Design a protein around this ligand. Structure first.
Ligand SMILES: *[C@H](NC(=C)C(=O)O)c1c(COP(=O)(O)O)cnc(C)c1O
Ligand SMILES: *[C@H](NC(=C)C(=O)O)c1c(COP(=O)(O)O)cnc(C)c1O
Lengths: 377, 377
């Protein structure tokens, strides 16, 4: 029952942000904005009012591009491959709505419901990939399956919203490449605590989660080979105006402030040491699961040493997590997320309570949670 | 050459916002956020970090609904008919992508390019409506035309981004209703200086303009008869999850902060007196056009007494406004918008410089502009 690695990171992180009113263990849903991030945003809006809205935006180009670059660095793409979105669903929809010719797709059974929804809405046939009892892709079986039965692209949610299994992203991406098939990665969850530098052809993620930037921002990155094959829904493909596929994908009103906010927030991840941060988040999972290994009416779902901060609890006596969550919030200020089946229809047989705490979490807090979980009605 | 009505409104408005670095005459592109609005936004983001992101959002429901209601009041819809968007293009796309059965449409020749683009992208046949030499719809001819040749809906940009003609919105809407045809109104420009209470079946607008709220927010309002006929692209119409058409349209990650920001900003319009504000904006146009009636190399396009703050200048010696604009900004701190043909392809034969100043503008400033316009190379 091993103890915690003391890191000045956990502490710097905590103090860089407003103090939690209660106890916040859902950076997986929406993390917490640093003062700098918050202020960077406010600043932009202030500046919009001074110099003019679109001149302010121009002025922010350095900062916007900063963020692209930072994002690019974490996924191994070019900054010029990275576009801004409203989030990871805007992202996957921009992508799939743009996707040329044949629209077959393989993905995990664990695939995110709203993703499947976008997949379906864009007319993709969607096969499952072989997995283990956890939902972790069997990379071998999948390679064989993908050669035998080819598919127009593979969509890998590298880290799932509903379960803290880290998918073997890089080895699936090579397997898929060996079969001559592109890989889209949903890194909404993964960007910030999984090595997202893995060879993917497109990646997307959201600002508000592990990168702890503003809501209303996400990113989509597409390798230029793929980017230029894409056919944006809007404008129509018979286009008088000459702009690139990515320029088309990034077209539309948006909170630029939030985007500069985001840029700060990514910068801050890089600043803290990507690799340093992921190791802590992995530890956070360990501690979280070791601390929660002993709770009646609640089973920990993920293997102890999954390198992840998402841990999920299945109720062993029919308790509904949705309720437990809103209890935990209203009574004890503890913020959690409650994952309904719709999050992963073809894998979740039963809902779960999701702890997703950041580096800042202490063993006290994990213990406060465990405690408060027991006292829960 | 009549003078200005002194109103404590102009002054209250100015002082409620950060002071303009130079001179800002493009509230038509992006206006200026009050301190309250800016702070309301920051606050939300701060609060996200304290209590949790989605609990903060819940908490803001009062404020969010406030804004719907306020918007609703200005267009004569129910607050429950109003949904939040990213802007007026998200809006028209959400609408047209959702539109059932036959997709014919009539609109002005003056129709906004990006609108036509969305129209086309959603497979609408798009007829023009009869207009005068200004582009103002001939309501009579149009009624006759719409009875003789029916169309699945009419799309009226009530106030055009490229020209400060106020379209006879209410009388066209009855004409269209007398022919049994619904009206969608693009009130991106109009919401805030035209009476948008006119009988339209859907209306949409943006936060960042005359309502001077945050970027990344717009609104879409749809009357329930129409709302429930609509078929959202995403999720697919074969939907396991039971949510209303509007709930579907409002689904997706977003800057909630910005939305509460917006709510403040609408509130502030109501607070100032809608009718009071529009009368000033109309005066602003008068003054703007009277002050600019005498400039060489620049003709005022709109009739003097169009009840509008948008005035546009056509260069009489081949000057490119794009350039003049970026000169005006870099040299004299005067912010303007330069309207390229793409803004209204089937009406604009030639680009224009657009003054769109708010209530705060003084005759000095309009004169400073006129002056600075002369000295421009
Ligand atoms: C993020 N989502 C959540 C609210 C959560 O609690 O998990 C998410 C997204 C959705 O992207 P948006 O930015 O549009 O919200 C994408 N896919 C995954 C795996 C996920 O974690
Ligand atoms: C607003 N647009 C401008 C940038 C301008 O300078 O006019 C606009 C919109 C576009 O909506 P978004 O909120 O997506 O930008 C819609 N239609 C009109 C008439 C217009 O003024």
């Amino acid at each position: 029952p091993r103890g915690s690695h003391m890191v000045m990171l956990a502490q710097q992180w905590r103090d860089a942000r407003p103090k939690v009113a209660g106890l916040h263990l859902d950076s997986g849903a929406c993390s917490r904005q640093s003062f700098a991030v918050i202020d960077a945003t406010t600043a932009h809006a202030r500046h919009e009012a001074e110099v003019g809205g679109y001149v302010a935006a121009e002025a922010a180009t350095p900062a916007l591009d900063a963020g692209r670059a930072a994002v690019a660095s974490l996924i191994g793409f070019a900054a010029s491959d990275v576009v801004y979105t409203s989030g990871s669903n805007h992202a996957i929809d921009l992508l799939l709505s743009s996707w040329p010719g044949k629209r077959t797709l393989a993905c995990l059974p664990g695939e995110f419901g709203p993703n499947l929804s976008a997949m379906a809405a864009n007319g993709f046939q969607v096969r499952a990939l072989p997995v283990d009892d956890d939902g972790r892709v069997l990379v071998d079986e999948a390679s064989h399956e993908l050669s035998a039965h080819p598919v127009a692209l593979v969509h890998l949610t590298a880290l799932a919203s509903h379960r803290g299994i880290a998918q073997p992203a890089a080895e699936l991406v090579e397997a898929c490449h060996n079969a001559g098939i592109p890989v889209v990665i949903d890194a909404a969850q993964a960007l910030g605590h999984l090595d997202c530098n893995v060879g993917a052809d497109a990646v997307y993620s959201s600002s508000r989660k592990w990168l702890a930037g503003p809501r209303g921002v996400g990113v989509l990155a597409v390798r230029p080979e793929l980017a230029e094959r894409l056919q944006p829904r809007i404008p129509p493909s018979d286009w008088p105006i000459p702009m690139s596929v990515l320029e088309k994908l990034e077209l539309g009103e948006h909170n630029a402030a939030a985007r500069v906010g985001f840029s700060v927030a990514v910068g801050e991840h890089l600043a803290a040491g990507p690799t340093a941060v992921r190791e802590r988040l992995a530890e956070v999972g360990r501690l979280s699961r070791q601390v929660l290994a002993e709770v009646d009416g609640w089973r920990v779902v993920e293997p102890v040493d999954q390198p992840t901060a998402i841990t999920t609890l299945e109720s062993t006596d029919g308790a509904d997590p949705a309720s437990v969550r809103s209890w935990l919030i209203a009574e004890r200020g503890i913020v959690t997320t409650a994952c309904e089946l719709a999050r992963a229809p073809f894998e979740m047989r039963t809902p779960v309570l999701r702890i997703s705490p950041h580096v800042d979490v202490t063993v006290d807090e994990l213990e406060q949670f465990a405690a408060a979980l027991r006292e829960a009605p």
